[PDB]
Design an enzyme around this catalytic site. Structure first.
Site, PDB file in Angstrom:
ATOM      1  N   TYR A 111       0.828  -1.202   0.000  1.00 22.03           N
ATOM      2  CA  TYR A 111       0.000   0.000   0.000  1.00 22.03           C
ATOM      3  C   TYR A 111       0.863   1.254   0.000  1.00 22.03           C
ATOM      4  O   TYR A 111       0.594   2.199  -0.738  1.00 22.03           O
ATOM      5  CB  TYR A 111      -0.931   0.012   1.213  1.00 22.03           C
ATOM      6  CG  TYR A 111      -1.864  -1.175   1.273  1.00 22.03           C
ATOM      7  CD1 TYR A 111      -3.128  -1.122   0.698  1.00 22.03           C
ATOM      8  CD2 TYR A 111      -1.482  -2.351   1.906  1.00 22.03           C
ATOM      9  CE1 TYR A 111      -3.983  -2.205   0.754  1.00 22.03           C
ATOM     10  CE2 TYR A 111      -2.329  -3.436   1.965  1.00 22.03           C
ATOM     11  CZ  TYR A 111      -3.577  -3.359   1.388  1.00 22.03           C
ATOM     12  OH  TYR A 111      -4.419  -4.442   1.449  1.00 22.03           O
ATOM     13  N   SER A 159      -8.794  -8.921  -3.395  1.00 19.13           N
ATOM     14  CA  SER A 159      -8.031  -9.563  -2.336  1.00 19.13           C
ATOM     15  C   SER A 159      -8.608  -9.265  -0.952  1.00 19.13           C
ATOM     16  O   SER A 159      -8.934 -10.183  -0.195  1.00 19.13           O
ATOM     17  CB  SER A 159      -6.573  -9.098  -2.414  1.00 19.13           C
ATOM     18  OG  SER A 159      -5.866  -9.397  -1.225  1.00 19.13           O
ATOM     19  N   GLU A 160      -8.750  -7.987  -0.629  1.00 19.29           N
ATOM     20  CA  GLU A 160      -9.194  -7.588   0.699  1.00 19.29           C
ATOM     21  C   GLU A 160     -10.631  -8.018   0.964  1.00 19.29           C
ATOM     22  O   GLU A 160     -10.961  -8.431   2.076  1.00 19.29           O
ATOM     23  CB  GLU A 160      -9.039  -6.083   0.899  1.00 19.29           C
ATOM     24  CG  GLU A 160      -7.620  -5.654   1.251  1.00 19.29           C
ATOM     25  CD  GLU A 160      -6.598  -5.953   0.171  1.00 19.29           C
ATOM     26  OE1 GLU A 160      -6.156  -7.117   0.061  1.00 19.29           O
ATOM     27  OE2 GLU A 160      -6.202  -5.018  -0.546  1.00 19.29           O
ATOM     28  N   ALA A 161     -11.478  -7.930  -0.052  1.00 18.66           N
ATOM     29  CA  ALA A 161     -12.848  -8.408   0.058  1.00 18.66           C
ATOM     30  C   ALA A 161     -12.880  -9.920   0.220  1.00 18.66           C
ATOM     31  O   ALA A 161     -13.677 -10.455   0.989  1.00 18.66           O
ATOM     32  CB  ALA A 161     -13.660  -8.000  -1.156  1.00 18.66           C
ATOM     33  N   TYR A 164     -11.901 -10.191   3.925  1.00 17.65           N
ATOM     34  CA  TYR A 164     -12.984  -9.676   4.748  1.00 17.65           C
ATOM     35  C   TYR A 164     -14.291  -9.575   3.987  1.00 17.65           C
ATOM     36  O   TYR A 164     -14.407  -8.797   3.041  1.00 17.65           O
ATOM     37  CB  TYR A 164     -12.605  -8.341   5.372  1.00 17.65           C
ATOM     38  CG  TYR A 164     -11.595  -8.498   6.477  1.00 17.65           C
ATOM     39  CD1 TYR A 164     -10.237  -8.412   6.219  1.00 17.65           C
ATOM     40  CD2 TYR A 164     -12.002  -8.752   7.781  1.00 17.65           C
ATOM     41  CE1 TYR A 164      -9.314  -8.571   7.227  1.00 17.65           C
ATOM     42  CE2 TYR A 164     -11.081  -8.909   8.797  1.00 17.65           C
ATOM     43  CZ  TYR A 164      -9.736  -8.818   8.513  1.00 17.65           C
ATOM     44  OH  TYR A 164      -8.811  -8.970   9.516  1.00 17.65           O
TER      45      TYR A 164
END
EC number: 3.2.2.22
Length: 247
Positions: A111, A159-161, A164
């Site tokens: 990031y 990825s993040e979804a 989470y």
């Protein structure tokens, strides 16, 4: 390998997509039923491509590290692309074999470097179905001047979804438009290693955290998580990362 068309995308379709995304990722078990990814895998299996057709019908494959859900790059025609980090280059050896050129990016896949290259932080980044579309458009045109943000909007929207389900829903609801991610969303992205690791620890500790993970709850405020009893944790933490892959 995962695939999803933006054309006709909906919250249901996105949920399906992210579901398919986590379905592509292998897993050795599940702590609290939460799929614990396959830490040990052949480098060939350690990556899985997301095929993604934007609204404009422009498809591009995103190279995902299945063991960490981490995006390593993407492909567009014969031109493939990969972060400057040695993880993406390794990935490049297995994925997009047919791609006539592997492009090493001018920024790392973290990031920090992405925000620097993009010149804009993820808090100011758009998120939602149009964002993945936008990402595809930008990435396929690989405007390195800004592709960084596009990568970020895409990574979080995938990825993040995948990790989470909270992030999944928030993004997936934005079928028709987009929004800058909540501090809760972003907190999840960061806490993924800590929270889940402590879940594993807690699994052998009657659910007690050793190190209390500070998570931002939906109200944009830090909340102490010392127990796996937290429903926002157990219900939203779709994918569990390996202790061997974390730190």
């Amino acid at each position: 390998d995962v695939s999803f068309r933006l054309s006709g995308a909906t919250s249901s379709s996105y949920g399906v997509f992210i579901s398919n995304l986590r379905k592509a990722l292998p897993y050795e078990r599940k702590l609290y039923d939460i799929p614990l990814l396959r830490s040990t895998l052949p480098g060939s299996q350690r990556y899985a491509l997301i095929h993604l057709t934007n609204y404009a019908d422009e498809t591009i494959s995103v190279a995902i590290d299945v063991t960490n859900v981490y995006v390593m790059g993407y492909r567009a025609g014969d031109t493939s692309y990969f972060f400057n980090e040695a993880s993406a280059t390794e990935a490049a050896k297995y994925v997009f074999k047919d791609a006539k050129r592997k492009v090493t990016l001018p920024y790392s896949g973290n990031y920090e470097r992405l925000q620097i290259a993009a010149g804009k932080i993820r808090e100011n980044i758009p998120l939602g179905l149009p964002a993945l579309d936008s990402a595809i458009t930008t990435l396929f045109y690989y405007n390195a001047n800004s592709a960084a943000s596009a990568l970020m909007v895409l990574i979080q929207s995938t990825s993040e979804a995948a990790r989470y389900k909270f992030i999944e829903q928030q993004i997936g609801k934005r079928v028709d438009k987009t929004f800058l991610p909540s501090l809760a969303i972003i907190s999840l992205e960061n806490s993924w290693s800590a929270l889940s690791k402590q879940i594993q620890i807690a699994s052998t500790n009657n659910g007690q955290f050793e190190t209390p993970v500070v998570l931002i709850n939906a109200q944009n405020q830090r909340v102490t998580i010392t127990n796996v009893d937290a429903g926002v944790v157990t219900s939203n933490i779709a994918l569990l990362p390996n202790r061997n892959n974390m730190a």
